[PDB]
């Protein structure tokens, strides 16, 4: 019946879509997800949340998912919506591989999910998918690429971006310290740790609290390795060493 109905897709008198804006707020509450692009490789690092001692941690990184051999994504937002979208992304990549026997390029995957996300806003009187995800991938057509998809269905190709709780602060640090045309994944990894230390209120950036995954092309194979906690620990110490060196300068 009309009385028990939520408009969901109806336009505001202002002209904005109210539900989509509300969904964006949910992404803001979710944990920090940050991506930095370097010429050698593209990396996605996200902050683990609700790290209670009893959790098994057997999911091989809850935030990070591998959509295809050459593509990966991390999502901030309602977990249930994320699981539905991550499965859909994997199917779209596979369906392309069968129709044309070549891996999906990247923007095509982002646009295809984005088309679904917009469709929910467009019609059906149904709740929008309140999830925002960053896509890191390599393609023959345009090399390493990074993309961000909003709940609205609009997408972007940012070389460096953050979609988590402290996104405004992370982007400001990224804009100032990202060196365009300078690669070195190691420099990008250090920048990521510094952004994470600012974004995370908890000090010391504990290795368990953060997850880091790096996509690099080796021997023409594209390897989405996930950094081990020991690798994360050495990186945090390196950030501390730089902070200590600044203290020595002071």
């Amino acid at each position: 019946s009309r009385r028990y109905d939520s408009r969901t897709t109806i336009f505001s008198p202002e002209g904005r879509l109210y539900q989509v804006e509300y969904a964006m707020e949910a992404i803001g509450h979710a944990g920090t997800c940050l991506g930095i692009l370097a010429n050698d490789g593209v990396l996605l690092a996200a902050e683990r949340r609700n790290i209670h001692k009893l959790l098994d941690e057997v999911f091989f990184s809850e935030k990070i998912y591998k959509l295809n051999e050459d593509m990966a994504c991390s999502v901030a937002g309602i977990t249930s919506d994320a699981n539905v979208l991550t499965n859909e992304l994997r199917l779209i990549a596979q369906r392309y591989l069968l129709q044309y026997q070549e891996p999906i390029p990247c923007e095509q995957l982002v646009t295809a999910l984005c088309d679904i996300k917009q469709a929910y806003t467009q019609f059906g009187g149904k709740r929008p998918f309140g999830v925002s995800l960053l896509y890191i991938g390599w393609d023959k057509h345009y090399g390493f690429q990074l993309y961000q998809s909003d709940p609205s269905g609009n997408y972007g190709g940012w070389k460096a971006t953050c979609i988590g709780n402290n996104s405004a602060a992370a982007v400001s640090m990224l804009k100032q310290d990202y060196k365009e045309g300078e690669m070195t994944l190691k420099s990008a990894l250090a920048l990521a740790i510094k952004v994470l230390n600012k974004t995370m209120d908890v000090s010391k950036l504990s290795a368990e609290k953060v997850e880091i995954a790096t996509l690099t092309r080796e021997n023409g194979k594209t390897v989405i390795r996930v950094l081990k906690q020991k690798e994360v620990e050495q990186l945090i110490k390196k950030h501390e060493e730089e902070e200590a060196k600044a203290e020595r300068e002071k």
Partner: protein, 239 residues
């Protein structure tokens, strides 16, 4: 599926939802289109480059077919669906009634899709008004504008987006008989309209002009800067 009319006439006799959809176009980034004697030209503003962001992904000018091209102002996501739907119709028009697609036909198709969303139950109207610029078999350059409601009007020159009214007034006042001509002058007229755009960044404004006998070419940023320099030289001449 959901079967209730999203847009219903209000007592004043106006479809309120369609007016709200137009408001989304008003909030959209400004887009300017002019038709040259032989070269059709269209331009976009408010690139708002964040340095980290990549421009190719955010481009707001696309070629539906070799003959036609489009620019959009309004909700970005809605446009991506309408552009891809037009691309399918243009190729489908070739499979049936074999021949190229006339610019007027593609604008009627985009208008009919937009009207159908207003006249359909359960679906919110598209939030995009579009400038479709193309050359027909006769070679006459044609530019058309599609409202969110779904009305298409041929326009020799027009602009849509934030501060559309100011640019539209500037375009009619600055419009020159012979369409400026010389190709560069027609591009300059858009560059002058781009200067009339509030940002007036220079590099920030990006425009693409179709020869209308060949294929759409995006102006190189350095090439656009040289055209902006021509406008700056004209400003020095005015001084």
């Amino acid at each position: 599926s959901y079967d209730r009319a999203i847009t219903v006439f209000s007592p004043d006799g106006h479809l309120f939802q369609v007016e709200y959809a137009q408001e989304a176009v008003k909030k959209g980034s400004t887009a300017v289109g002019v038709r040259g004697r032989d070269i059709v030209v269209l331009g976009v503003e408010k690139k708002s480059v964040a340095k980290l962001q990549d421009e190719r992904t955010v481009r707001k000018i696309c070629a539906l077919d070799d003959n036609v091209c489009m620019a959009f102002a309004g909700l970005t996501a809605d446009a991506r669906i309408v552009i891809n739907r037009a691309r399918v119709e243009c190729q489908s028009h070739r499979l049936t009634v074999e021949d190229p697609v006339t610019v007027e036909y593609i604008t009627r198709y985009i208008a009919s899709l937009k009207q159908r969303y207003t006249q359909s139950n359960g679906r919110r109207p598209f939030g995009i008004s579009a400038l479709i610029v193309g050359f027909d078999f006769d070679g006459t350059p044609r530019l058309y504008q599609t409202d969110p409601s779904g009305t298409y009007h041929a326009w020799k020159a027009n602009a849509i987006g934030r501060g559309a009214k100011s640019v539209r007034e500037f375009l009619e006042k600055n419009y020159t008989d012979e369409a400026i001509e010389t190709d560069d002058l027609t591009i300059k007229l858009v560059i002058k309209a781009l200067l009339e755009v509030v940002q007036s960044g220079g590099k920030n404004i990006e425009l693409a002009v179709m020869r209308r006998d060949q294929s759409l070419k995006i102006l190189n940023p350095e090439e656009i800067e040289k055209y902006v320099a021509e406008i700056e030289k004209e400003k020095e001449e005015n001084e």
